[PDB]
């Protein structure tokens, strides 16, 4: 593989789309690689990590409990509810809802949790309160995945998302237990985590949340590193490509390959 920046450029040429990426040390925030890091990209399901950070902040303040059971109705469900459609009789706890949102990308779980933090506007306010002045959530699932060209709704930048993830995971804004919970939910991703491990060399840590839109977008927020350590945050977003989902996936994987082969920068 080529050097990471060279591979990112090649991916734009092959996809005819825009790529945005940051690679950052998790412990310190050192930025190693920036490419279109201040340009906007749709978050898609990657927003669910920030959502559950806001839920955990409420738990830490005594305004929520991960144990609290939410009884919801079938009319509350939106498209793609693999976990939440199974619990119309018995409900789900707040913590189960976050696990479903992050680890299964369950959309109805995410909307139930979004309500608890004051909707898109409440989540955006939380972001402002932790010093992210760029990321914005405007819509609910599934409309937030529309990814219309030129639309600023439901977007982040690679730089803002990486900094926000680092804040949630490490800055002691969340309690120790809450930081550990957020990390574990990402470690437990079932959508892409197992597939990524099956193509990662031995020794590499992964934790992640992915997102997708049928209108030529794709993204991942990840923790990655050798020696089984979550050394770096890697954020990659794609937009405005006509390419197949498979080719979007392959190009993101190719950027990862370039990082792995050229890690010590």
Residues 144-163 that bind ligand MA4 (CB under 6 A): none
Q: Residue-wise over 67-103: b if at least 16 C-beta within 10 A, else e? A: eeebebeeeebeebbebbeebeeeebebbbbbbbbbb
Residue number with CB closer to ligand MA4 (1 or 170): 1
- The CB-of-195 to ligand MA4 minimum distance in angstroms stands at 9
Q: Is residue 211 annotated as involved in ligand binding? A: yes
The Cβ of residue 253 has, within 10 Å, a number of other Cβ atoms equal to 16
Our answer to whether residue 6 is catalytic in this structure is no
Distance CA 115, CA 23 (A): 32
Residue number with CB closer to ligand MA4 (110 or 220): 220
Q: 157: which 2 tokens?
A: 């930048």
Choose one: 46-54, 61-69, 88-96, 216-224; the region binding ligand MA4 (CB under 6 A). Answer: 216-224
Torsion of CA 48, 21, 200, 45, to 10 degrees: 20
Q: Is residue 210 annotated as involved in ligand binding? A: yes
Q: 138: which 2 tokens?
A: 């405007």
Per annotation, catalytic residue among 45, 105, 160, 213: 45
Residue 256: partners with Cβ closer than 8 Å, 6 or more residues away: 224, 234
Q: 147: which 2 tokens?
A: 């990814």
Determine which residue in the list 194, 224, 225, 238 makes contact with ligand MA4, applying CB under 6 A: 224
Determine which residue in the list 199, 242, 244, 245 makes contact with ligand MA4, applying CB under 6 A: 199
Q: Is residue 252 at the binding interface for ligand MA4, with CB under 6 A as the rule?
A: yes
CB-based closest residue to ligand MA4: 256
- Active-site residues, by number, are 45, 143
Binding site for ligand MA4 (CB under 6 A): 1, 196, 199-201, 220, 222, 224, 234, 236, 252-253, 255-257, 260-261
For the annotated binding site for substrate, the residues are: 209-211
């Amino acid at each position: 593989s080529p050097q990471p920046l060279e591979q990112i450029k090649l991916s734009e040429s092959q996809l005819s789309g825009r790529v945005g990426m940051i690679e950052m040390d998790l412990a310190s925030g050192r930025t190693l690689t920036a490419w279109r890091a201040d340009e906007r990209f749709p978050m898609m399901s990657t927003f669910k990590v920030v959502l559950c950070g806001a839920v955990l902040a409420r738990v830490d303040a005594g305004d929520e409990q991960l144990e609290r059971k939410i009884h919801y109705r079938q009319q509350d469900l939106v498209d793609y509810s693999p976990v939440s459609e199974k619990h119309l009789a018995d409900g789900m706890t707040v913590g189960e809802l976050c696990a479903a949102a992050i680890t299964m990308s369950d959309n109805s779980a995410a909307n139930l949790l979004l309500a608890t933090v004051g909707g898109p506007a409440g989540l955006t306010a939380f972001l402002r309160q932790i010093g992210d002045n760029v990321t914005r959530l405007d819509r609910w699932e599934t409309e937030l995945n529309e990814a219309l060209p030129g639309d600023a709704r439901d977007t982040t930048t690679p730089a803002s998302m990486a900094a926000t993830l680092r804040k949630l995971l490490t800055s002691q804004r969340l309690s120790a237990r809450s930081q550990r919970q957020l990390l574990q939910w990402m470690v437990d991703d079932r959508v892409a985590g197992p597939l990524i491990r099956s193509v990662l060399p031995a020794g590499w840590f992964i934790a992640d949340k992915t997102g997708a839109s049928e209108r030529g977008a794709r993204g991942i927020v990840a923790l990655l590193g050798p020696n089984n350590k979550a050394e770096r945050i890697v954020v990659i977003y794609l937009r405005d490509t006509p390419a197949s989902m498979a080719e979007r996936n392959q190009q993101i994987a190719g950027i990862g390959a370039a990082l792995i082969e050229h890690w010590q920068r």
